[PDB]
Amino acid sequence: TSQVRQNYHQDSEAAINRQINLELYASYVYLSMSYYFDRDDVALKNFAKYFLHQSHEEREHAEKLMKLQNQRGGRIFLQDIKKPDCDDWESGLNAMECALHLEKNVNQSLLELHKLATDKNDPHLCDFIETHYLNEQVKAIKELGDHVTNLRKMGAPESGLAEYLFDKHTLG
Amino acid sequence: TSQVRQNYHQDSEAAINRQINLELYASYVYLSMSYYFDRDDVALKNFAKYFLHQSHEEREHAEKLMKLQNQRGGRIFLQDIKKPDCDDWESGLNAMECALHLEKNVNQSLLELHKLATDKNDPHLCDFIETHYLNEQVKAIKELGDHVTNLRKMGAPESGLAEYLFDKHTLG
Amino acid sequence: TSQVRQNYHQDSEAAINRQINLELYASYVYLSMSYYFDRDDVALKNFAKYFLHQSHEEREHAEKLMKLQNQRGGRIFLQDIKKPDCDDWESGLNAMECALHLEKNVNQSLLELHKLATDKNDPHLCDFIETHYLNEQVKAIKELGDHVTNLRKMGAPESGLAEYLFDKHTLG
Amino acid sequence: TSQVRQNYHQDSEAAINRQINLELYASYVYLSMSYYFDRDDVALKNFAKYFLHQSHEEREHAEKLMKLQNQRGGRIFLQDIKKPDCDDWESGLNAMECALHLEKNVNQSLLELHKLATDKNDPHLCDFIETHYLNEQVKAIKELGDHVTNLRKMGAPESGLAEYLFDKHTLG
Amino acid sequence: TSQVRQNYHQDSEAAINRQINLELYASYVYLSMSYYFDRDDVALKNFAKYFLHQSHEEREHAEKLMKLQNQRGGRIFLQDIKKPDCDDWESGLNAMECALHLEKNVNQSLLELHKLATDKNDPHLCDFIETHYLNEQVKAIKELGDHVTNLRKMGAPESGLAEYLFDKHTLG
Amino acid sequence: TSQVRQNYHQDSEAAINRQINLELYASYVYLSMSYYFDRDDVALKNFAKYFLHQSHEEREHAEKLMKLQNQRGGRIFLQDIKKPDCDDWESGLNAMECALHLEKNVNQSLLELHKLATDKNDPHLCDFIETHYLNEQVKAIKELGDHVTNLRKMGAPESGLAEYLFDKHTLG
Numbered sequence A, B, C, D, E, F: 001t002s003q004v005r006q007n008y009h010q011d012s013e014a015a016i017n018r019q020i021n022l023e024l025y026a027s028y029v030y031l032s033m034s035y036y037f038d039r040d041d042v043a044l045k046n047f048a049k050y051f052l053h054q055s056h057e058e059r060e061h062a063e064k065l066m067k068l069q070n071q072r073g074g075r076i077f078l079q080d081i082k083k084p085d086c087d088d089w090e091s092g093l094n095a096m097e098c099a100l101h102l103e104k105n106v107n108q109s110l111l112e113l114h115k116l117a118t119d120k121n122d123p124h125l126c127d128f129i130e131t132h133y134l135n136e137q138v139k140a141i142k143e144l145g146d147h148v149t150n151l152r153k154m155g156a157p158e159s160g161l162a163e164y165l166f167d168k169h170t171l172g
């Protein structure tokens, strides 16, 4: 047992390791999306920039969870980072919809983590999740939903002009 | 169902709409108080300034709740903003006591909202309430209680000199 | 009778109270419109910003009328602020058309107020209306008419691209 | 009953008074440690500085709890501040281990306080504890654990060179 | 015996430990007074500020005595810090009178300490007391006497207006 | 075939995808090492900082290879990022030796990549490897070899003082 460990349940430690893997996976998904839009036959530089920024953000989320794991005296156990579901993300609208799906999945995982911390009476972990992850997820989901709405209303994916102008005016 | 909606109960959405109305109502009450003290036969400019500032603050609280409602994918339903209970607020001390009563009512509504969010296992909403409303209410109630105490100790409302000097030295 | 009251007819005082309510109502309508465009399934941030600014402006108009009421020695009597006619404003073009209708209604009320002040030989009130409200209404109506014209010419509401680009280039 | 008191249980008020005493006690313990390292036969100035800073920090924690007690309308009841368990803290490593023990005791008290506030449905008090005390305790415990680990690995307390160099390089 | 000890009598060392406790006690008394005036039913913020400043000053006095004890090679022995005589200080005037009584008690203790240092032919300790404590006590006593005189002359404690205006104009 | 593809062999494209995976793997290894040294029972903050910096650098190397793949008209195919070989890196010296082994492995992969590009007569790819990767690997290997030499000469891993002072003076 770690000399710093106090009120930190083994179930919570395991769930934090699972969340670390999920954040690293999300980072990898966004990296794949970013370099899809960097292809010469897609060529939407601001979509590429948007998703690269998200990928770096998800890496930061993972590192904050690793820092928490050490702060509480749990032990980090890393796992394989699985490859993303797609190599070809088909369009800006499809990538935004996949990102929305992924962010809602990550949010569900975080809500389950909060439920576990509540059940184990770990208010520090509950506060950590609420303070650093829950509103970040709500904001990310709202932003992605807005992007999806605008792309659809503009005529994406059938209108390449729609994605070009969205790339310029919203993501630029 | 909104594409962004996740873990947002219909009861919580309804209670947020009720709180929006309550904040707009509080804004209206403070506006009435402010312009009562702007009357030529009352003529306490810093009481008027104090309550105008509170009115603008309550409008901001309402707008933050509307923003939350959209962030979570709920739908804003506005209602009539009822007129304040008084047209004549009788004195600075009476207006401060009415404001204290109103802030404790709003606080009770927020505590009921927090209880509902806890019962529906919505930690994001609980965190939103705690972070942006609960300590604001506690601070507002403590400030109003202090003002009431000082006005009473100075001899208000029978001493017009008391309210004049309080207007100058505490609210100025 | 107020010690400051001079040449201020009771009919004028009543009409000023009615105008105060109308300005607060207009503020509420614009607030509703603003947060309609903040929805994730509408997602036009600059429409939302435009109407929020108008809502704050209408609150300022109401407060200037309350200040006038006290300056002249009349007494403010507040009434319920009725809810806006719509919860769903359907599109940027429809909201702009409703705003144009509302501003022309407010202008008609102000012209009736000016007629009353003229009939009661209250040149200070006539000057107040002309100086602070009449050209503001004419400018607001012309601006809204311009917005409606451009949205229609661009193909709104059927073209979501039209409202997206109007949001970006005119309202942004 | 205080005019500001709302949703503040007498048990919570009593537990806050107990925590105030515990924070003042911790401040006294750290003060004793600091001036132990200021002795001419110990002479570790940066250990002395470290513990003096902690003592002032614990005084600040106590004052924030007193401020909370008044904000909620509870009444502060002070008790004797008991003397620290030791006059002679024997070594830098022993003092760091005693500080780690003390911080884990204070953390346990704060977790019991949070459990009580949760049981009494006082979300403002829960938020106060989480926001201002729980992560502070986790960070303090992790820091002390790190210091203990490094001192042990360097050969303290048998190596006076170890504590000298730790004083210079980590605490300086 | 400490390697630095020279011309430092054991009686002087004991009396310095007693003075350390007395200064810490005075700090605690002032802390209690400060947060009495922070209550919502007392609400005199500048009285609260005044006594908080005095409390921090008394902590500094205690720390300077601890530093002296180590400089001379004596050993600090801490004792319990007894709780203050009152929880409720009843009024600004009563608190100022209690503070005057406390400062005269501390001054008497310091004069006895000086007499002891003179009797033991310890000129360094005599100089320390004269330089850092005696005129500080005389100035504090004169200031408190002035405050008491002004509060009484203004009509305190029966006049709440008196304490309000003293809080504003003398302590603000 | 990509419209930009010229003199880019399918074997080279495959080897670039393999190198992308190897760089991401190296980033993950360094991340694991970094947070090993962040544990409370290891507590070497500058080792942790060193390896975190290396992890971010390896992510940058991977992204530059992905950028190259798109510049040449090849297609990125991502694979699973395998977990690092160790969860516990045992000591600063052992982690530095593992890092040296890993960097020499990555260097061997890059030399094989250069041999392939030479065999396929792809001077742009050869230049890319030489310019951005080969001297970076040589410098990294020399730096790690220096660190290993110094840690061994200082007495690591048996001397915890050795790793403490190396952490302070070389990595700090």
Ligand code: NA
Pocket (backbone or CB within 6 Å): A021, A022, A025, A082
């Ligand atoms: Na996954």
Ligand code: NA
Pocket (backbone or CB within 6 Å): A100, A101, A102, A103, A104, A105
């Ligand atoms: Na999903």
Ligand code: NA
Pocket (backbone or CB within 6 Å): A097, A100, A101, A104, B003
């Ligand atoms: Na989805």
Ligand code: NA
Pocket (backbone or CB within 6 Å): A108, B006, B007
């Ligand atoms: Na879900």
Ligand code: NA
Pocket (backbone or CB within 6 Å): B021, B022, B025, B082
């Ligand atoms: Na109401």
Ligand code: NA
Pocket (backbone or CB within 6 Å): B040, B041, C002, C003
């Ligand atoms: Na009058």
Ligand code: NA
Pocket (backbone or CB within 6 Å): B100, B101, B102, B103, B104, B105
């Ligand atoms: Na109430």
Ligand code: NA
Pocket (backbone or CB within 6 Å): B097, B100, B101, B104, D003
């Ligand atoms: Na009340």
Ligand code: NA
Pocket (backbone or CB within 6 Å): B108, D006, D007
């Ligand atoms: Na209540």
Ligand code: NA
Pocket (backbone or CB within 6 Å): C021, C022, C025, C082
């Ligand atoms: Na109306």
Ligand code: NA
Pocket (backbone or CB within 6 Å): A149, B002, B003, C040, C041
């Ligand atoms: Na939708």
Ligand code: NA
Pocket (backbone or CB within 6 Å): C100, C101, C102, C103, C104, C105
């Ligand atoms: Na109209």
Ligand code: NA
Pocket (backbone or CB within 6 Å): C097, C100, C101, C104
């Ligand atoms: Na119209």
Ligand code: NA
Pocket (backbone or CB within 6 Å): C108
């Ligand atoms: Na008309």
Ligand code: NA
Pocket (backbone or CB within 6 Å): D021, D022, D025, D082
């Ligand atoms: Na204790």
Ligand code: NA
Pocket (backbone or CB within 6 Å): D040, D041, E002, E003
């Ligand atoms: Na010695």
